[PDB]
Amino acid sequence: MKMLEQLEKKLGYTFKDKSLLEKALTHVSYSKKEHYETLEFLGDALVNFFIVDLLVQYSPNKREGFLSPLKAYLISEEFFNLLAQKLELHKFIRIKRGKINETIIGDVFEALWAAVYIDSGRDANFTRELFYKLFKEDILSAIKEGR
Amino acid sequence: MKMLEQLEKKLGYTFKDKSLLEKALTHVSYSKKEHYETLEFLGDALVNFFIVDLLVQYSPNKREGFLSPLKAYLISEEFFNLLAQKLELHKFIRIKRGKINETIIGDVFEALWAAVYIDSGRDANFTRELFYKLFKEDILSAIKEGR
């Protein structure tokens, strides 16, 4: 369809179980029985780790006072939306009632990485490094800019 | 006095960089130059991930509603100290002015895990396994422990 799962080519990764990927992309308004909500919950903590790990390695200054606000931006909806563009998740998400929002794209973006993690055999290094190959550039840049 | 790092024996891990271990148990009070501050910033995200991945895996109700208040119990001070006590970390911490603070042995438990992770060569899988080895039965129990 519109979907086709050609996201995996944008993503650089091919899913084993294709139901995973779909559950990450599916809003509850499309499906109340199989949507992204629990993937999202895992994906928030996962991605948070990926970003805090990078941040502590590439930040000009290693003080919590400099890190936390920067951390705050790098895990925000606006930033996640900036990173999702590259994947253009809004083409593959399935939702019902006309309320796609930017917070949903962030939800899905977080769910997506949780989906890659699990479909990878819960391998965090691989998944970490896959996140880095796609977004490290953009993160270092934001880190460059500060704020 | 009461050190000699039997903690590596408590933990089941030997640091290739003993100084790294040391910095994780040292509050600024004992050294404004080499304390647990940045490791803490890393292990919070680190430890947040390990516990959420467990939550999301073994929790009965895979719902944001159930998860998130169950979650904030697991990453709660009370639990963290609970976990720490199986390492008697309280006694290996190097703070000045006898002001331990229950919400300081929480920062050291986190720093300690960032320290293992980094020393291990940034190996998330390994570190998560060591963490589970040490505390999954607790969490899996604390989770089914009502609500």
Side-chain angles (χ1 to χ4, degrees), chain B residues 7-47:
Chain B
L7 189 48
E8 290 159 302
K9 321 159 79 37
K10 286 202 124 294
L11 276 157
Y13 182 74
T14 301
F15 272 82
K16 297 182 307 225
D17 183 342
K18 267 64 172 127
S19 74
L20 226 191
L21 217 194
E22 262 189 325
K23 186 189 189 135
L25 320 141
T26 309
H27 179 298
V28 232
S29 59
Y30 203 108
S31 165
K32 90 171 142 217
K33 316 224 208 128
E34 287 271 317
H35 43 121
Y36 56 78
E37 178 181 311
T38 310
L39 296 167
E40 164 189 27
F41 184 91
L42 215 209
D44 148 21
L46 220 224
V47 177

Side-chain angles (χ1 to χ4, degrees), chain A residues 27-69:
Chain A
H27 195 248
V28 51
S29 62
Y30 188 97
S31 185
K32 64 161 179 167
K33 284 160 167 206
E34 282 302 56
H35 53 100
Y36 64 65
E37 188 188 67
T38 311
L39 286 168
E40 183 193 343
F41 192 75
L42 216 210
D44 175 8
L46 212 241
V47 164
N48 173 58
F49 161 58
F50 295 169
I51 275 115
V52 164
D53 196 23
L54 201 67
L55 201 246
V56 156
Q57 286 178 86
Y58 283 100
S59 169
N61 121 36
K62 269 66 176 127
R63 285 144 175 206
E64 112 95 50
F66 182 89
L67 303 170
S68 282

Side-chain angles (χ1 to χ4, degrees), chain B residues 30 37 58 66 93 116-117:
Chain B
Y30 203 108
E37 178 181 311
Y58 292 98
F66 185 66
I93 285 146
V116 175
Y117 166 64

Side-chain angles (χ1 to χ4, degrees), chain A residues 10 16 18 22 25-26 28-29 34 38 41 49-50 55-56 66-67 71-72 79 84 114 117 120 127 130 137 142 144:
Chain A
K10 298 193 158 248
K16 267 75 210 295
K18 231 84 126 172
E22 277 194 316
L25 294 169
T26 309
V28 51
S29 62
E34 282 302 56
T38 311
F41 192 75
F49 161 58
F50 295 169
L55 201 246
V56 156
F66 182 89
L67 303 170
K71 185 189 142 303
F79 189 61
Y117 176 49
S120 90
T127 300
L130 218 219
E137 245 220 282
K144 249 256 133 284

Side-chain angles (χ1 to χ4, degrees), chain A residues 19-139:
Chain A
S19 86
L20 273 198
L21 217 229
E22 277 194 316
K23 183 166 189 202
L25 294 169
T26 309
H27 195 248
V28 51
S29 62
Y30 188 97
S31 185
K32 64 161 179 167
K33 284 160 167 206
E34 282 302 56
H35 53 100
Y36 64 65
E37 188 188 67
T38 311
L39 286 168
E40 183 193 343
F41 192 75
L42 216 210
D44 175 8
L46 212 241
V47 164
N48 173 58
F49 161 58
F50 295 169
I51 275 115
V52 164
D53 196 23
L54 201 67
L55 201 246
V56 156
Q57 286 178 86
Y58 283 100
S59 169
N61 121 36
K62 269 66 176 127
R63 285 144 175 206
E64 112 95 50
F66 182 89
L67 303 170
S68 282
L70 228 172
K71 185 189 142 303
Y73 166 74
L74 289 165
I75 64 173
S76 79
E77 183 183 299
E78 299 75 0
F79 189 61
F80 278 179
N81 267 282
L82 203 274
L83 297 179
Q85 282 179 123
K86 333 302 179 193
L87 308 160
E88 73 182 41
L89 279 179
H90 64 314
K91 244 108 265 253
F92 309 77
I93 280 132
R94 332 194 263 170
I95 166 163
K96 185 194 263 219
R97 301 105 168 203
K99 172 145 80 199
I100 204 283
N101 294 206
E102 309 180 293
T103 128
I104 273 145
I105 293 170
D107 289 336
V108 165
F109 180 83
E110 296 159 24
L112 183 58
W113 284 104
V116 175
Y117 176 49
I118 309 184
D119 180 293
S120 90
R122 284 195 139 72
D123 176 346
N125 300 322
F126 166 83
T127 300
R128 176 185 69 216
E129 295 312 298
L130 218 219
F131 186 90
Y132 284 171
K133 155 165 223 197
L134 294 153
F135 311 129
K136 186 177 147 151
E137 245 220 282
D138 298 284
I139 300 177

Side-chain angles (χ1 to χ4, degrees), chain B residues 69-94:
Chain B
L70 207 188
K71 162 178 178 315
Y73 248 100
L74 292 195
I75 310 190
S76 108
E77 242 287 313
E78 200 201 275
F79 198 74
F80 266 29
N81 281 253
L82 207 138
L83 303 151
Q85 195 35 54
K86 329 286 219 257
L87 310 170
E88 309 184 53
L89 215 171
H90 87 280
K91 71 159 151 204
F92 308 94
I93 285 146
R94 306 201 319 213

Side-chain angles (χ1 to χ4, degrees), chain B residues 96-143:
Chain B
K96 177 139 342 296
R97 304 213 125 302
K99 38 106 35 118
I100 317 248
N101 303 278
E102 202 167 72
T103 288
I104 257 198
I105 102 110
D107 322 341
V108 178
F109 183 73
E110 293 175 315
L112 174 76
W113 284 106
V116 175
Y117 166 64
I118 310 222
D119 187 52
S120 81
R122 245 45 192 231
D123 179 351
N125 296 334
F126 161 79
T127 316
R128 173 241 296 154
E129 296 290 49
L130 221 191
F131 185 91
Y132 288 170
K133 212 32 113 224
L134 309 184
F135 320 113
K136 157 171 207 214
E137 60 167 54
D138 292 70
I139 306 145
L140 292 205
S141 104
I143 284 175

